[PDB]
Amino acid sequence: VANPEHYIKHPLQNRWALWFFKNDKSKTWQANLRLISKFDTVEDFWALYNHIQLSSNLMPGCDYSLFKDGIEPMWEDEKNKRGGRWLITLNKQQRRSDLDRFWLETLLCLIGESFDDYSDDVCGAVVNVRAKGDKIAIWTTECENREAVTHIGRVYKERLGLPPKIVIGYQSHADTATTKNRFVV
Amino acid sequence: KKRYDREFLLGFQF
Ligand SMILES: *C(*)(F)(F)(F)S(=O)(=O)[N][C][C]1O[C](N2[C]=[N+]([C]C3=[C][C]=[C][C]=[C]3)C3=C2N=C([N])[N]C3=O)[C]([O])[C]1[O]
């Protein structure tokens, strides 16, 4: 038969679903959350990424959310309720320089499965486009797993290329909706 | 099981 290496799509470990949040106050938060499309290969990822707008070009109050097929971009989802997020705080000047660069590095960390065995703990990621300052976060399934959370946050910091002086905080979803850092790297 | 390098993935952009 034919060597599949000449015609086959490069498959990912997980199928990923990209979501979009359009800020509307007349509707509830969940009503604004909409699904864009699903992909489970490398080519289909770039087929989606190339035709959508960058995070810097969105309106204030819009979110991109890339999660595993089956997990919704909210804390009340089974996979999310017991975990938390590695938050990256950006300023207004980092929208031009860092925002689109950090988000695509974040996207490649998810689909590329860059955290070894602890890539299974990863639920997804979401970029917040706000006028007061942009935010990027990687969500995990369990905040109690110390070894899992610490590895993801360390390797994620190394991928983005953040200086050692910059300190980022992991905060759980249960503490955010009731903020304090459970871990720092 | 299925893992990729960042520089391998960037080559499939165009
Ligand atoms: C923002 F994080 F920017 F989205 S927000 O400050 O929460 N926007 C205000 C409004 O958003 C609602 N919200 C946001 N999320 C996503 C989320 C989860 C964990 C940490 C940060 C953001 C959710 C909700 N609401 C619900 N019910 N589930 C979510 O997952 C908040 O209610 C807030 O009033």
Which CATH number characterizes residue A129's domain?
A: 3.30.760.10
Give CA angle at A174 (A71, A23), nearest 5°. 60
Three-state SS at A137: strand
Q: How many domains does chain A have?
A: 1
What backbone phi and psi angles, to 5 degrees, belong to A101? -75, -45
Question: Given B2, B6, B12, which is nearest A11 (Cβ)?
Answer: B2
**What approach was used to elucidate this structure?**
X-ray
How far CA A106 is from CA of A3, A10, A136, A180, in Å, comes to 33, 19, 8, 23
Rounded to an integer, what distance in angstroms lies between the CA atom of residue A110 and that of residue A156? 10
Q: Which of residues 31-90 of A touch B (CB under 8 A)?
A: 42-43, 45-46, 49-50
Bridge partner list, A138: A86, A125
Whether A112 and B6 lie within 8 Å, measured CB to CB: yes
Rounded to an integer, what distance in angstroms lies between the CA atom of residue A95 and that of residue A129? 9
| Chain B residues with CB-CB distance to A51 below 8 A | none
Alpha helices in A20-170 (DSSP H): 29-32, 42-49, 78-81, 94, 100-111, 146-160
Resolution in A: 2.7
A80's CB contacts (< 8 A; 6+ apart) are: A71, A72, A74, A123, A139, A141, A173
Could you identify the residue written with the tokens 């060597």?
A3
Residue type, A15: R
Contact by Cβ (8 Å): A151, A115: yes
The DSSP output letter for A59 is P
Counting Cα atoms < 13 Å in the Cβ hemisphere of A142 gives 9
* Sheet strands side by side (includes A183-184): A33-41, A11-21, A62-68, A122-129, A135-140, A84-89, A169-172, A183-184
Bridge partner list, A183: A170
Whether B2 and A12 lie within 8 Å, measured CB to CB: yes
Nearest to A11 by CA among B6, B4, B13, B7: B4
CA A29 distance to own-chain centroid: 18
Rounded to whole angstroms, the maximal C-alpha distance in chain A is 59
Nearest to A64 by CA among A123, A121, A22: A22
| Chain A residues with CB-CB distance to B12 below 8 A | 10, 42-43, 46
Q: String of b and e for A38-71 (b: at least 16 CB within 10 Å)? A: ebbbbebbbebeeeeeebbebeeebbbbbbbeeb
List the domain range (segments joined by +) for residue A100: 1-185
Count of beta carbons in the 10 Å neighbourhood of residue A95: 18
Counting Cα atoms < 13 Å in the Cβ hemisphere of A118 gives 18
Whether A113 and B9 lie within 8 Å, measured CB to CB: no
Question: A176-183: long-range contacts (C-beta < 8 A, 24 or more apart)?
Answer: A176/A75, A176/A84, A176/A85, A177/A75, A182/A84, A182/A143, A182/A149, A183/A146, A183/A149, A183/A150, A183/A153
